[PDB]
Scaffold this active site. Structure first.
Site, mmCIF file in Angstrom:
data_model
loop_
_atom_site.group_PDB
_atom_site.id
_atom_site.type_symbol
_atom_site.label_atom_id
_atom_site.label_comp_id
_atom_site.label_asym_id
_atom_site.label_seq_id
_atom_site.Cartn_x
_atom_site.Cartn_y
_atom_site.Cartn_z
ATOM 1 C CB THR A 271 6.692 12.151 -7.942
ATOM 2 O OG1 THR A 271 7.306 11.437 -7.330
ATOM 3 C CG2 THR A 271 6.972 13.808 -7.949
ATOM 4 C CG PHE B 240 11.019 9.285 -10.717
ATOM 5 C CD1 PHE B 240 11.139 8.803 -11.842
ATOM 6 C CD2 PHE B 240 10.372 11.323 -10.961
ATOM 7 C CE1 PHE B 240 11.260 9.356 -13.075
ATOM 8 C CE2 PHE B 240 10.763 11.772 -12.154
ATOM 9 C CZ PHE B 240 10.333 10.434 -13.054
ATOM 10 C CG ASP C 218 9.626 10.380 -5.462
ATOM 11 O OD1 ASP C 218 8.635 10.073 -5.140
ATOM 12 O OD2 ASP C 218 9.801 11.290 -6.050
ATOM 13 C CD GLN D 84 -3.014 1.191 2.431
ATOM 14 O OE1 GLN D 84 -2.767 1.127 3.641
ATOM 15 N NE2 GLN D 84 -3.639 1.858 2.219
ATOM 16 C CG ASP E 262 -1.534 1.483 -4.990
ATOM 17 O OD1 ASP E 262 -1.098 2.828 -4.277
ATOM 18 O OD2 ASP E 262 -1.141 1.006 -5.832
ATOM 19 C CD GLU F 101 -7.896 3.083 3.508
ATOM 20 O OE1 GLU F 101 -6.524 2.754 3.583
ATOM 21 O OE2 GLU F 101 -8.877 1.827 3.294
ATOM 22 C CG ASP G 287 6.636 6.760 -3.708
ATOM 23 O OD1 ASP G 287 7.137 7.382 -4.119
ATOM 24 O OD2 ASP G 287 7.745 6.754 -2.529
ATOM 25 C CB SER H 98 6.781 11.792 -3.766
ATOM 26 O OG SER H 98 5.689 10.318 -4.014
ATOM 27 C CG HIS I 58 -8.010 -3.239 -2.752
ATOM 28 N ND1 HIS I 58 -8.307 -2.670 -3.894
ATOM 29 C CD2 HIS I 58 -7.182 -2.678 -1.843
ATOM 30 C CE1 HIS I 58 -7.714 -1.135 -3.869
ATOM 31 N NE2 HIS I 58 -7.191 -1.034 -2.224
#
Ligand code: HEM
Ligand SMILES: *[C@@H]1O[C@H](CO)[C@@H](O[C@@H]2O[C@H](CO)[C@@H](O)[C@H](O)[C@H]2NC(C)=O)[C@H](O)[C@H]1NC(C)=O
Ligand SMILES: *[C@@H]1O[C@H](CO)[C@@H](O)[C@H](O)[C@H]1NC(C)=O
Ligand SMILES: *[C@@H]1O[C@H](CO)[C@@H](O)[C@H](O)[C@H]1NC(C)=O
Ligand SMILES: *[C@@H]1O[C@H](CO)[C@@H](O)[C@H](O)[C@H]1NC(C)=O
Ligand SMILES: [Ca+2]
Ligand SMILES: [Cl-]
Ligand SMILES: [Zn+2]
Length: 595
Positions: A184, A186, A188, A105, A108, A258, A110, A190, A351
């Site tokens: 992004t 990448f 990375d 997760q 995903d 979440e 990222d 994020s 999932h």
């Protein structure tokens, strides 16, 4: 397509071609095409969009209009007949810890985010969508089929809003709708730092010159830091317990709260960054706030890349790992780094790996208190159980000592996700992740199952017998045919997830191809990949190769006993060692003076 709720294109920026640091948006990674891989662009299309009208209307929008001469079955109906099951006994994955699910997760998040069209707040729209089930513009409601129990308790449908898409530009000629990736492409980190400069700054601690990320100032985890609160109202995290009134966290990624274990993981990452920044300040007292932030950010990025390619992908891809992700041969500037539309459905295999409960374990890896094991549905948008019910350590222990769900053709998605998902915009534990996934495939104009098989060079079944052979399962194949009539019509999410898993892997052949390909591109097309010579010194890389998720936990919690291989199923105490025996990240190769 049609421009109602589209996203404005390319707030431009000039490129620092000599910087050793990633931009926040991902611009300037590719020198010839600086926008490739940047946030807020159209997800790449590996095959052309397939729409009812050829432009933006999804299949199943117009009752009369078939797909290849057959109506598409309702998303909720496919969910009921195929995806559900009753019995949780025996469903768990005996050779994967719950950290297997949770890492996926994280990765995903990222890589991709296609946020729902901003209809606005104050919506009569939300009302018309939810209350009246009136399909139109951005509202594409998931209608309940005949005899569905939700009819009796919920209404005629679940609301569903269409994904955000790229605005049409001044030619204004007819083109198929492209959905936006808001993060992004990448790998990375994020999800820690943000993909947008303004958020990226608000997350930083700019009060001190230490290059730390901001931490919560109203709550502490026995001394250790929490993410700051999100003060945006209204709060789904408050809604679930109005007594507690604990808001959502504010992270580099919008989806961070979440579920409680995802919020946990985001906590570990924040702590790691601050730890790295403090250690680097001791090594290099002269380095300023900016340099400190950039350097720890750069370490955390590489950490996520190493865990993903060394530890995670081999256990997903199994025998196919080597075939799609051969050994690295350096940065290839001709490789497309963008995430593809279809990858955002392929990576939803996760999932089927989520179990129906979550445990808090005590220091002896024993049930923590009287309600140690909670139904997963009670943990959607739940921050109060962290702040008011023991911090993160008891959850982290559950990650290590409990197991992922195993995918199973007869037991696909837990009812916690299939019947009781909570959506942040709405008020009930009443939604269906499976039906949403299938609605969303259509929203995004996904070509069908046989198109993807072809793309992957795999046989394309035409008949019930053909499908039976591919699925190695006669009953499932028949239920699929009864619903879809033709394999050509099967939505890619249920299609790829239906296939038996490859040897030593956790996904079937169609998905291993789609995922393998994307991951290869994610590495090969990244100028800042950690193993790209020049990014890190050789001595830095030698240090980095020692990272593990077990070390991460040791450094960032009061847990002192951990397994050496965090991703396999591990039992306490047999499989657990003292933290002091576990490899450390040596930061000496980062020391830098001018003399
Ligand atoms: C709650 C949810 C989870 C856990 C209890 C969960 C778990 C995963 C895993 C383990 C994934 C990969 C290994 C994964 C991938 C993606 N998800 Fe999913 N997920 C939970 C809830 C959601 C919800 C809600 C959505 C949005 C559905 C929609 O279409 O509106 C969702 C999506 C995704 C997704 C696509 C992301 C994107 O590009 O927009 C994954 C790749 N998950 N989840
Ligand atoms: C930004 O960094 C500063 C300085 O490190 C943080 O300040 C410290 O806060 C903790 C907890 O409140 C105290 O125990 C320290 O003694 C404080 N020291 C100083 C130097 O003031 C500050 O809290 C950080 N800001 C945010 C919002 O995270
Ligand atoms: C809400 O939180 C309180 C602590 O503030 C707790 O004792 C109570 O059981 C919670 N209620 C719900 C709805 O879970
Ligand atoms: C780099 O990428 C392009 C497109 O994928 C390809 O034609 C070429 O074979 C690759 N070159 C290297 C260095 O492997
Ligand atoms: C359990 O996991 C590890 C992964 O490294 C592996 O060596 C062992 O054979 C596994 N069993 C499986 C994949 O069923
Ligand atoms: Ca990213
Ligand atoms: Cl695609
Ligand atoms: Zn403690």
């Amino acid at each position: 397509s049609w421009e109602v709720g589209c996203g404005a294109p390319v707030p431009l920026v000039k490129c620092d071609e000599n910087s050793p640091y990633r931009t926040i948006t991902g611009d300037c990674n590719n020198r010839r095409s600086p926008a490739l891989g940047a946030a807020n662009r159209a997800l790449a299309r590996w095959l052309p969009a397939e729409y009812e009208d050829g432009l933006a209307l999804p299949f199943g929008w117009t009752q009369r209009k078939t797909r290849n001469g057959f109506r598409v079955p309702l998303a909720r109906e496919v969910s009921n007949k195929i995806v559900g099951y009753l019995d949780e006994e025996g469903v768990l994955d005996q050779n994967r810890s719950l950290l297997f699910m949770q890492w996926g997760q994280i990765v995903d998040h990222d890589l991709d985010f296609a946020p729902e069209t901003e209809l606005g707040s104050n919506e009569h729209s939300k009302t018309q969508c939810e209350e009246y089930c009136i399909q139109g513009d951005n509202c594409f409601p998931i209608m309940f089929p005949k005899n569905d129990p939700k009819l009796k308790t919920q209404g005629k449908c679940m609301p569903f809003f269409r994904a955000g898409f790229v605005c049409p530009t001044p030619p204004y000629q007819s083109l198929a709708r492209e959905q936006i990736n808001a993060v992004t492409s990448f790998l990375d980190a994020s999800l820690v730092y943000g993909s947008e400069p303004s958020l990226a700054s608000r997350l930083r601690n700019l009060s001190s010159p230490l290059g730390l990320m901001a931490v919560n100032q109203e709550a502490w985890d026995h001394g250790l830091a929490y993410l700051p609160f999100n003060n945006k109202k209204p709060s789904p995290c408050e809604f679930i317990n109005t007594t507690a009134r604990v808001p959502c966290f504010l992270a580099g990624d919008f989806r961070a709260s979440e579920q409680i274990l995802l919020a946990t993981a985001h906590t570990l990452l924040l702590r790691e960054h601050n730890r790295l920044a403090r250690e680097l300040k001791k090594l290099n007292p002269h380095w300023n706030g900016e340099k400190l932030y950039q350097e720890a950010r750069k370490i955390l990025g590489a950490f996520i890349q190493i865990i993903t390619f060394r530890d995670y992908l081999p256990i997903v891809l199994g025998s196919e790992m080597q075939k799609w992700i051969p050994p690295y041969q350096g940065y290839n500037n001709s490789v497309d780094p963008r995430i593809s539309n279809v990858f955002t459905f392929a990576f939803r295999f996760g999932h089927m790996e989520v179990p129906s409960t979550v445990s808090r374990l005590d220091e002896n890896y024993q049930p923590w208190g009287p309600e140690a094991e909670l139904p997963l549905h009670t943990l959607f948008f739940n921050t109060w159980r962290i702040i008011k019910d023991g911090g993160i350590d008891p959850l982290v222990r559950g990650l290590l000592a409990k197991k992922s769900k195993l995918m199973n053709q007869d037991k696909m998605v837990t009812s916690e996700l299939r019947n009781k998902l909570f959506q942040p915009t709405h008020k009930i534990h009443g939604f269906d992740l499976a039906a949403i996934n299938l609605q969303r495939c259509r929203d995004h104009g996904m070509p069908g199952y046989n198109s993807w098989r072809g793309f992957c060079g795999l046989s394309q079944p035409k008949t019930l017998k053909g499908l039976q052979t591919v699925l190695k399962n006669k009953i499932l194949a028949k239920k699929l045919m009864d619903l879809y009539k033709t394999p050509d019509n099967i939505d890619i999410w249920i299609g790829g997830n239906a296939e038996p898993m490859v040897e030593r892997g956790r996904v079937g052949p169609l998905l291993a191809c789609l995922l393998g390909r994307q991951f290869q591109q994610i590495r090969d097309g990244d100028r800042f990949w950690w193993e790209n010579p020049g990014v890190f010194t050789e001595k830095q890389r030698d240090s980095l190769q020692k990272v593990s998720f077990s070390r991460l936990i040791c450094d960032n919690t009061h847990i002192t006993k951990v397994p050496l291989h965090a991703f396999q199923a591990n039992n306490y105490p047999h499989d657990f060692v003292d933290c002091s025996t576990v490899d450390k990240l040596d930061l000496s190769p980062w020391a830098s003076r001018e003399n």
